[PDB]
Amino acid sequence: QSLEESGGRLVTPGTPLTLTCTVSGFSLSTYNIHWVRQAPGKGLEWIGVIDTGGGTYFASWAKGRFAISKTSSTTVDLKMTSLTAADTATYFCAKGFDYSASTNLWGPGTLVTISSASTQSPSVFPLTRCCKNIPSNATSVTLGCLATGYFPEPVMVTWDTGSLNGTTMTLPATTLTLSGHYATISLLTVSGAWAKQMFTCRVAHTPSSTDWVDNKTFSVCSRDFTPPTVKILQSSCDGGGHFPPTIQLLCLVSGYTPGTINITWLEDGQVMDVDLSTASTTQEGELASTQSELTLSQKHWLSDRTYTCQVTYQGHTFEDSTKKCADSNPRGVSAYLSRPSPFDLFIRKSPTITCLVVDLAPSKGTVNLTWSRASGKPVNHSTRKEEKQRNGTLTVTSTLPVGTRDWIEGETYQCRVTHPHLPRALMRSTTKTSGPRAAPEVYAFATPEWPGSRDKRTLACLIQNFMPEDISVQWLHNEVQLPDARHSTTQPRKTKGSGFFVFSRLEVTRAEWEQKDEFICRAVHEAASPSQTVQRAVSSVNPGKHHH
Template sequence: MVTDHLGAIQERDREPDGPHQPQAPNGGPGTSASIQSPFVFPLIPCCKHIASDATSVTLGCLATGYFPEPVMVTWDAGSLNRSTMTLPATTFTPSGHYATISLLTVSGAWAKETFTCHVVHTPSSADKEVNKTFGVCSRNFTPPTVKILQSSCDDDGHFPPTIQLLCLISGYAPGAINVTWLENGQVMKVDSPTPPATQEGELASTQSEFTLAQKHWLSDRTYTCQVTYQGGTSEDSTKKCADSNPRGVSAYLSRPSPFDLFISKSPTITCLVVDLAPSKGTVNLTWSRASGKPVPQIPKPVQRQQRNGTLTVTSILPVVTQDWIEGETYQCRVTHPHLPRALVRSMTKTSGPRAAPEVYVFATPEKLESRDKRTLACLIQNFMPEDISVQWLHSNVQLPDARHSVTQPRKTKGSGFFVFSRLEVTKAEWEQKDEFICRAVHEAASPSWIVQQAVSVNPGLAGGSAQSQRAPDRVLCHSEQQQGLPRAARGSVPDHHCHCGAGRADWPSLPELDVCVEEAESEALWTWTGLCIFATLFLLSVSYSAAITLLMVQRFLSATRQGRPQTSLDYTNILQPHA
């Protein structure tokens, strides 16, 4: 197109008759030209000659056929980085008209920008400029559509060990294309996929793959597929969703209690689904075993509507104690027409080291309690794993769970766990002389899975007034190993000194239970010893005072017999006699 215009200009310059015959620009005779405004043409590189990853491109603006000199060429390139250069003017013969070229080099996102060349020729039109606006390529093109897809989860709804990301690039005219994979903005991979062959006029599509480890995907990093095409950039990003459960629905499994496993022999596993939205669809809970063995028939899941409008669904599966002990894995699968995928939860016996619990029972002093109740506390510690059942018994009859409270297992400073249980008893119950037993059921407590300690009271030991002079209550402490002994042989000590534990007792440092009685006797012995020492010191003090007084009287009488007047006694000399 530029060549055609130049040819037309040259043909015009060859015409013999012109409107004016001014002197040639060099002033030489025989050559003349009239004042002429410039013709302006954009100079654009062909798109196929521009690399898709080119960071810069050069454009041109041709001003030709003008007379006389000079022309001024300026550029509008928006916010892109740029540099310009105007070449020296050349002359056409025999017309004497001029032509010049101005070059513009830009870098950045040049593919999506347009550029304007402004040409001003003052001699022909001082107040008018010629403008040409154009893009980099001589044809229009549509940028590609970029979309990232990720690999699906496994059958249990968990992410696989490696995550595969697929960048789908579609809807662009065939041409060179570059793909860059970024992780949190850092380049991880550069790819140049080759699109499949297409028919004339059809748009192309291609793809690029990127594989990463599961731990990187779960670390909440952002992955970006960045596509460079015809100098422009298109991209899409993805990351792990904050909540992998659909619509906030959650499912939980609760393991069987040690009491149900080892004492009542009726263990169950409960599957609880919460935050379900009310709908016409049916929630299905399916149980299975990892070994493939059948599960027993169970009743239909129980569905309840909560105050916030959501639904909870509960299903209870009976299990066999021996199967659980041997490490069988049980699975609860939840499906619903409105859930995009099933919720799957699995449970098996806790692995790791085992340790039997230690049990200690404490009775608070009577003076710290109200008149009509006593509080018993049970410390159970250093057991592993954390699954444990706690019960209280009175006269070998189990008390309802509602009568006592138990904390959740907490980690000790070591590797074990501990819990506290609290029981309130009435004064009437406390004074029945019957035992209160704190019992812990745990899988490591062999051979019967039970560790327990007892505490009891004997209210009337001394005579005197029942209200003010009654001897203090005395707690009978004995460990599980002492229960075969007569009650009198188990020992008794004041209730503010002895509290029972698993073979140990005290308040509060838990010395050996078997020395509770010896400690009381030792305390009495120390009391008598102290009284004897006090009496001895008192007698010595009295004797010393008497001796000093007698000495002073003797000196006084001796001085009197020597004739000294009583009015001038030197008491200083008496108190401090000369050597």
Template sequence: MTLVLKAMALTCLVLLLLQNAPGVGAQMYPDFKLQQPQSSVVVIKGDTLTLNCTLSGSGPVGAVKWVKGSGSDNQTVYEQKGSFPRVMRAVSAPSNDFTIRISNVSLEDAGTYYCVKFRKGIVDDVVFRKGGGTEVSVHARPSVPVVSGPSHRAVPGQSVPFTCSAKEFSPRDIKVKWLKNSTLVRAEPPHITPELSNSSYRMSSTVQVKLSEDDVRSELTCKVQHRTLAAPLRKTYALHQALRVPPSVSVVAAPSGAVEVNKTVNFTCRVQGFYPGAVTVSWLENGTVMNAGSSTQPTETSRGLFELNDTVTVQAGEEKSGSRFTCLVVHEDQEPISGTGILRVTAPALGENNEGLIGDSSDILLSSPGLWLGLLLDKALLAVILFFLFKRILP
């Protein structure tokens, strides 16, 4: 009896060993097929990845799993038992369709995936059939580009740098174009570097732009093209953010030219063609600060620049002739820009303000004893002359 039991145990062991031997499974289940049709798949970061696998024919008892990688370091991605939060079967069990979907794909999900049929072994499950593998490439769309300009405003004629940057894209290849309004601006190829935290990349592109007064209403656009995008990403920078146009300053007097004593003169400071539209205006009389003038609000011109007038009123006293009235304009915390007007005062014309010298002559005589004495002496001299003339004539 003991010999019979030993023989039966030995027979079972031999059968198990034969079942686990290479090639025996295929002979035992000749109609079994495992189909993993996708050799490669490209998926965008954040999207859902679908991996196809179907079984047909009869096969041994054992699980079907999806694994990532091969050899001893492979990783189980999905099996019927266990929890895999991002992975689910496309078709509910029971079914011979073991297609799975992986949601919210990340760059770390890139790799080669295998659909594997196992069969029960003596100790552990043994690989019975393995698919050819699906190589998964994960691409990442670039972030919305960011355009940065100079830290300080520049004046017309200066050439200043602008930088466009984007990050977290994959694969590495990326194209950048710059447009000023609708005109292409030449730029160097973008500088591309790998991200430290994952398998993506970041890039920066810099362009030099020479500013002009008319750029108050100009736009600079960065266009980023990547294979993951159906249309380029665009980011626009308004050049007025980087531009400072200094004002021109002049002082005009009304009335112009020399004025008579005690007349009123308006000195107007014309501040023109500046941007941004905030200035501070002050007045000096011969270097001494005056009371504030009467200022208008800055008005925008058709070119997008600003202008304003500031007026100070002066009484033209004789002592003020030759006085200098200076308008000081401060724009964007820069050094003041000035304009100066000079007051010219003249004496009044003859005949004006002399009404006391025009009137009845008798009033003048009565009020002037010196005139009476002069008249009497004149008459006495005339009488003496006439007396001597008559004396000569008469015998």
């Protein structure tokens, strides 16, 4: 004999909302159903009652916005119209003995949010203890996940424990004092063979999306193995100070517990082909040693590129970095400000601009970063990320949502950068281009079949004669628009006559064209008609009907 509520979620102002009270144990032909609400931080507030005959009565503030209906023998629905932010509350249904709401059987309530802060997805991090503080026989162990920084409620955390039993315990959420976002800690206590067991938390955030799932996988140790150390050595330049014609980089991975180990060299973060480097593993006693050698031209070394030795060992990543040496390294802060992409403007319909400030020297204090509009109208709240980089600098990113209609009518947005160590303030500004318009021509092509390229093909797309230069190119295949990383797209360059062009190149695999051989190149552009997109499909099969 209990009651449960369902249907509480985050919706916009003005959206209708239906909550469902499912009862168990008793009959609705004997008992009435009360509805009571409670916002976070106030007292209880009676909404309404439905009797056994179906008659509903509501409070004086309700004013016909509420309706209660008996839908089945176990379910009672509450329909709610004309929502504003004052109805953000936890909603209880109760088994009423009479028309009074004096009762001992209540449901736990469901939570309805009408809010105006940003819908933020949670960040999920593992909570494991320090392994030297964990005993040898510790026949049970307690671990967890922290899901923080989300808005609004709720998150749902379940656990995959493998073959063990695990008792799961999810704490009530805490409002973070600085941001207003929420944070939960969900804890899992298991027993038995926990030292070699993989543990998994599943955090679902239905206000972000219905299928927003974070599926975090971790073990319960931060020792694991004895930790390797990575260092990079290099060739000397000679006695006159001059570089040799090739440069050797020797990445040394010192003594570790033997296992599979995996080395990638990066040039400014991009993976080089494994043919340009060697690797060697030796074993002495119970301990392994690994070296990797990379060969570089003198020109590339003098071009000041940064190289990263990336070690992957038992699912854990180690790294080390290097660039061309210097006696002194001057650097100053620089800033860049983007326009919104056409895809974000016209497909996603949620444009943003980003002010990216790079190569600042990490001195004392935070960098002042302010958004403004020339019209004096208000800006939205922005997001700010600060990230230390491999080359030792700190890069700060600020992303500002902009109005779609605002952007289209020619508003100018300004990014203003101040810092105490700066000589003067740095200024960047952005606005819709005042040049003319011209629609893109689109042409998609497939390269022919020839030896050595049976199960991988290259597709290409030419987009040309458009004006202005800002354009988004994507590839779509079998009712999914494929990720940007799958393909490459050139930077806009001027055509000989009038307008710009870009090329895009996409390598595809046999399974994709056997799945569907129809591939669509799509351009999003402000001058495109009727809905700011133009697209063209190609089939790679292109059959050889000689003389038609």
